[PDB]
């Protein structure tokens, strides 16, 4: 299926690629988990910074 004038495109989907899709919906939900654990550890560790 080659037609018209188009750049050749190598797109590697010939495996089963939908099993392995990782979408990040937690980008903002892991940011607060990460700011917690830093404030957890800020207190735990005493004035050690």
């Amino acid at each position: 299926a080659i037609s018209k004038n188009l750049p050749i495109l190598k797109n590697h989907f010939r495996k089963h690629w939908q099993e392995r899709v990782k979408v990040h919906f937690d980008q903002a939900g892991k940011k607060v988990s990460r700011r917690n654990a830093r404030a957890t550890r800020a207190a735990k560790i005493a004035p050690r910074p």
Binding site: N5, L6, P7, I8, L9, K10
Partner: protein, 185 residues
Amino acid sequence: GIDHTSKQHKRSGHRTAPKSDNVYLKLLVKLYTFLARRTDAPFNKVVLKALFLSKINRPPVSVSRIARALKQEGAANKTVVVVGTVTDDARIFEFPKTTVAALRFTAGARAKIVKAGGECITLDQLAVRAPKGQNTLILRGPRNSREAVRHFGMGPHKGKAPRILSTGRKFERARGRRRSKGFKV
């Protein structure tokens, strides 16, 4: 029935009005549809159809090209007009005084023009200063310097630079691009 030498109901293929929804844009299209009609001078009729131009058909006119047109004999006192955006060119280390009237200036070309004792204008003030167009220069920016036009008309022996993702060795330099592998073009 009628025997037509032409195709019927066939539009002219022009911009009767911009495709933009911009409000302040349409206030100039409103201002120059008035002057183009009643002022009898072709300048207004030229600036009107230049407000309808799409983006790709509006390349920016650098502040260096403005200095050439002033070196152009007799034009050092003219008020250059650019329907489009003026952009900065620092490769010129001197700039004249004069005046410029354009839709949009970049923040760099605003300083440079103001820096020399010159002045930046809008199109509306030009209509008030010179409705007929007295003592003006229109200037267009280069249209065919685009990256896509470099690819227009690809085909054998036309030297048009194929559309391609990656540039380097091993990408479409081999069979048909040189005599040693196969043929050339």
